[PDB]
Design a protein around this ligand. Structure first.
Ligand SMILES: C[S@@+](CC[C@H](N)C(=O)[O-])C[C@H]1O[C@@H](n2cnc3c(N)ncnc32)[C@H](O)[C@@H]1O
Ligand SMILES: [Zn+2]
Length: 370
């Protein structure tokens, strides 16, 4: 399968770049309980980070300028971000790493689904220990070159760390590697780390000789959150972004912008996400399909619990069906929620994974309208 052809299943990314008279504060309390950032992620099954972040969109110039032959993806889970990168840059090879709980044979599930094969992942971390897959461990960085002898020009980190200290542990280790490593030193100090960070306190200095070049605030990030992507390099250290700066960019995006839908619809993926939400749910999701699902339940303890869960889902999809076609924005998402009477029953009955799937299906339905 052609990687550039697969790129049409990924939505266009909206973001703000902050390069490193009182400003004023932009506030908007959206009365929402659902993770609406998954609204345009219906074409992806195991992970969907590529719908939020892109290397061509955010750091396209650096990608052009450095021209890496190998990219290093750490804390990458199912590898949807790596999969989008493989579609944007079809000649790039990858070194993949993500924290593993066992010695069992693992592989980025989303990359395999999107790209087809793993031939471009020259190091998938096969046969690696738990610590050798942990970005906060020295051994992880010492075995990063076991296959690839290319310098860490651009390292991508999307790890969801336990505590904020873990982020620093990783950054310090990246710095310690790029300044000791025979391969990386031979290159120079023009080495980059594009890492996920949760901006909380202000005036938090980055480790010694780690400088922030830019901060990226993504539309696809949880609205209540403080998540951003920082582009780091070697040089005189500066401050990390603070919660304040991030919220203002997070708010302008939420208030001003709409979510772009993917140009093409991956029907196999949508059908997979539907069956993941409510087993047996088929596309197109219409009046007929919702009455069919309602008819399956009346044909008849955990038995009453799973049917209660099903009624909750059908009821929500029925509300989406009987709702006007609007633009994909938080003003419309707030209208959708605040016009549904059983919102609190919905969040109580459904689990986090089910609710994320419910929003992906809702998004498919909203895009399908008219
Ligand atoms: C948000 S997911 C990455 C999603 C990825 N960008 C994608 O497209 O699928 C975060 C991943 O980081 C991993 N992780 C958590 N702590 C880690 C650590 N200390 N070192 C490395 N990976 C870690 C988690 O196990 C999880 O798979
Ligand atoms: Zn190195």
């Amino acid at each position: 399968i052609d990687p550039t052809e697969q790129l049409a299943y990924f939505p266009k990314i909206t973001f703000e770049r902050l390069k490193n008279y009182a400003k004023g504060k932009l506030t908007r309390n959206y009365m929402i309980l659902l993770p609406w950032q998954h609204v345009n992620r219906y074409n992806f099954v195991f992970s969907s980070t590529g719908c939020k972040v892109s290397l061509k969109t955010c750091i396209g110039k650096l990608m052009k300028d450095l021209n890496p032959k190998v990219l290093y993806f750490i804390g990458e889970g199912a590898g949807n971000w790596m999969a989008r990168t493989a579609c944007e840059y079809p000649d790039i090879k990858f070194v993949y790493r993500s924290l593993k709980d066992d010695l069992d044979h693992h592989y980025p599930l989303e990359y395999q689904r999107v790209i087809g094969e793993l031939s471009r992942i020259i190091d998938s971390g096969e046969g690696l220990s738990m610590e050798t897959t942990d970005a906060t461990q020295k051994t992880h960085w010492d075995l990063i070159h076991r296959v690839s002898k290319d310098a860490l020009l651009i390292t991508l980190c999307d790890a969801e760390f336990k505590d904020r200290d873990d982020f620093f542990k990783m950054v310090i280790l990246w710095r310690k590697h790029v300044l000791s490593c025979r391969i990386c030193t031979t290159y120079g100090t023009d080495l980059y780390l594009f890492a996920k960070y949760h901006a909380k306190d202000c005036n938090v200095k980055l480790p010694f000789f780690v400088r922030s070049v830019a901060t990226f605030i993504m539309q696809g990030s949880k609205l209540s959150g403080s998540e951003c992507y920082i582009l780091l390099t070697l040089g005189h250290h500066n401050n990390l972004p603070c919660h304040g700066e991030i919220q203002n960019s997070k708010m302008k995006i939420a208030v001003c912008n709409d979510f772009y839908a993917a140009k093409k619809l991956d029907n196999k993926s949508i059908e997979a996400n539907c069956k993941s939400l409510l087993s047996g749910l088929r596309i197109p999701i219409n009046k007929k399909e919702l009455n069919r699902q309602r008819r399956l339940l009346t044909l008849q303890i955990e038995s009453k619990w799973l049917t209660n869960k099903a009624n909750t889902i059908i009821d929500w999809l029925e509300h989406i069906l009987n709702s006007p076609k609007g633009e994909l924005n938080y003003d419309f998402f707030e209208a959708l929620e605040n016009t549904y009477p059983n919102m609190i029953k919905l969040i109580d009955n459904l689990g986090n994974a089910e609710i994320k799937k419910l929003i992906e299906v809702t998004g498919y339905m909203l895009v399908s309208k008219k």
